[PDB]
Write a protein that binds this ligand. Structure first.
Ligand SMILES: *[C@@H]1O[C@H](CO)[C@@H](O[C@@H]2O[C@H](CO)[C@@H](O)[C@H](O)[C@H]2NC(C)=O)[C@H](O)[C@H]1NC(C)=O
Ligand SMILES: *[C@@H]1O[C@H](CO)[C@@H](O[C@@H]2O[C@H](CO)[C@@H](O)[C@H](O)[C@H]2NC(C)=O)[C@H](O)[C@H]1NC(C)=O
Ligand SMILES: [Cl-]
Ligand SMILES: [Cu+2]
Ligand SMILES: [Cu+2]
Ligand SMILES: [Cu+2]
Ligand SMILES: [Cu+2]
Length: 497
């Protein structure tokens, strides 16, 4: 069952074997992925997170981010450690109490301390719309239509050796999959459909790193939502989904009753499907319980291309229809060298005092804020443009902005901007060498909002900045509860800081 919008959520250590290999993990709700947290648009979520972690090899502190939720007036509940809070220490709990006005769609939640979400603290977060404009396009939309794509590692995240390449050991679809090496015939996930019905499949990348080429043999997929933003219908036969992105698509169960492979090919790790790696099963009711015998095409006919997506609503693009046509036009210099990423020459290292607390304590320009050179102020009620030119090693990098979604004025692999009707989303691939992926948004949400690559290994290696949006109004806009005020003293005492 789904939990929420008011729920406890316990964070524990446990052994799991999602690909047949046992390792310890950091889990929400006792499972990988964690339980779906759900409610309706506009609801008050009160998620009391109980940190019960005891194994230091995966960190005993935690903090949880609710990915894609804007947190307007509740920046303190956003979750990124040392940006909006100190971590919750073991044996303590913290109530993330926030509202979701004006949002409805497919989201997720994850640890936002170090690389801890890779160790298992990841799960779906759905905000249903009772008056969804896409409601008539499908029959079924429930916990059984959520599809998570995850990378899974045999080596613990804190134990990945310095200087060696990090790749995953399995792709997990709905928590199950097979290992790329020493493959065993462990159970595959089954997604069940009834012939003739239409399903809102909510595809969630909970990846720490790889992008996936997602497809379903014999079927096509009609996209209706992108990162929480309703889209015009776009029929595709393959979706390249980057870390932290979401799509909803209509699946029409219009093929013969049978078994069909679900495929999720990562860009690193095991290539292909030998032994049933990178696979799950779409099973029609009344089909034999057996593996599919279908194949993929050699070449997909209608892959998703981001510039083909358009909002369902008339969202437009803020600002003026040319490069630099914004109140605050930025161009970030995104680089990598010698194991560290940097933005405008500064590698992100989390500060001792969370950025929000520094602001509440009276630091009132971004040059006063730590880490020095990592916090950029944005003015209020302004159109912001951020160009994110690619080229840094380890791409393609999926950049994500907290507190906001944004118009994708320029997408990967296409030099032409779109100032008319591009999709809006919250995580975007910046593409390849020579690209100039560019985003726009308006600043109507005071607080410090993280901007970073969502490949968690890259975030850990410094690929981030903080946008201190409307510093002057941050304190008045974001009243903080006593429990939040208690986090830093508790954390610093526990850690002898
Ligand atoms: C990406 O687009 C930005 C603008 O959004 C470009 O920025 C300009 O860069 C030149 C030097 O390269 C400066 O003279 C301008 O002041 C910048 N702003 C403008 C023209 O609006 C940037 O060069 C582009 N990058 C790539 C790699 O194409
Ligand atoms: C590259 O991106 C541009 C901009 O998003 C795409 O151009 C649009 O194409 C649609 C469909 O033909 C037209 O209706 C729009 O008028 C175009 N807009 C602009 C600003 O040119 C273009 O299709 C993309 N290229 C590819 C190969 O997909
Ligand atoms: Cl977010
Ligand atoms: Cu996220
Ligand atoms: Cu986020
Ligand atoms: Cu990256
Ligand atoms: Cu983040």
């Amino acid at each position: 069952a789904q939990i929420g919008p008011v729920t406890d959520l316990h964070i524990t250590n446990a052994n799991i074997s999602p690909d047949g290999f046992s390792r310890p993990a950091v889990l929400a709700g006792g499972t990988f992925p964690g339980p779906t947290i759900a409610g309706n648009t506009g609801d008050n979520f009160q998620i009391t997170v109980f940190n019960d972690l005891t194994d230091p090899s995966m960190l005993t502190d935690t903090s949880i981010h609710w990915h894609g939720l804007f947190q307007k007036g509740t920046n303190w509940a956003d979750g990124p450690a040392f940006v909006t809070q100190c971590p919750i220490i073991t044996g303590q709990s913290f109530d993330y109490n926030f509202n979701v006005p004006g949002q409805a769609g497919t989201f997720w939640y994850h640890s936002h301390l170090s690389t801890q979400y890779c160790d298992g603290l990841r799960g779906p977060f759905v905000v249903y719309d009772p008056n969804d404009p896409n409601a008539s396009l499908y029959d079924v939309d429930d916990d059984t239509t959520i599809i998570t794509l995850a990378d899974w590692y045999h080596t613990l995240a804190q134990q990945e050796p310095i200087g060696a390449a990090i790749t995953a050991d399995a792709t997990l679809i709905n928590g199950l999959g097979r290992s790329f090496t020493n493959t065993t015939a462990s159970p595959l996930s089954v997604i069940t459909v009834q012939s003739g019905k239409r399903y809102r499949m909510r595809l969630v990348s909970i990846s720490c790193d790889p992008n996936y080429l997602f497809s379903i043999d014999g079927h096509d997929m009609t996209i209706i939502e992108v990162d929480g933003v309703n889209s015009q219908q776009l029929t595709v036969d393959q979706i390249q989904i980057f870390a932290a992105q979401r799509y909803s698509f209509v699946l029409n169960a219009n093929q013969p009753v049978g078994n069909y492979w679900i495929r999720a090919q990562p860009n690193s790790g095991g290539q292909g499907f030998d032994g049933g790696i990178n696979s799950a099963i779409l099973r029609y009711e009344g089909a034999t319980v057996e593996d599919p015998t279908t194949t993929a095409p050699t070449t997909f006919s209608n892959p998703l291309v981001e510039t083909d997506l358009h909002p369902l609503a008339d969202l437009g693009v803020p600002g003026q229809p040319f490069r630099g046509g914004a109140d605050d036009p930025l161009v970030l210099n995104l680089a990598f060298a010698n194991g560290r990423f940097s933005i405008d020459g500064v590698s992100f290292v989390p500060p001792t005092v969370p950025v929000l607390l520094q602001i509440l304590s009276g630091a009132q320009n971004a040059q006063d804020l730590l880490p020095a050179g990592s916090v950029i102020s944005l003015p209020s009620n302004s159109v912001i443009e951020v160009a994110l030119p690619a080229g840094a090693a380890g791409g393609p990098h999926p950049f994500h902005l907290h507190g906001h979604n944004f118009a994708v004025v320029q997408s990967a692999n296409n030099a032409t901007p779109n100032y008319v009707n591009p999709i809006w989303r919250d995580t975007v691939s910046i593409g390849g060498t020579g690209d100039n992926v560019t985003i726009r948004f308006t600043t109507n949400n005071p607080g410090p909002w993280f901007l970073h690559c969502h490949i968690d290994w890259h975030l850990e290696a410094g690929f981030a900045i903080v946008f201190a949006e409307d510093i002057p109004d941050t304190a008045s806009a974001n009243p903080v509860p006593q429990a939040w005020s208690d986090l830093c003293p508790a954390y610093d005492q526990a850690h002898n800081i």
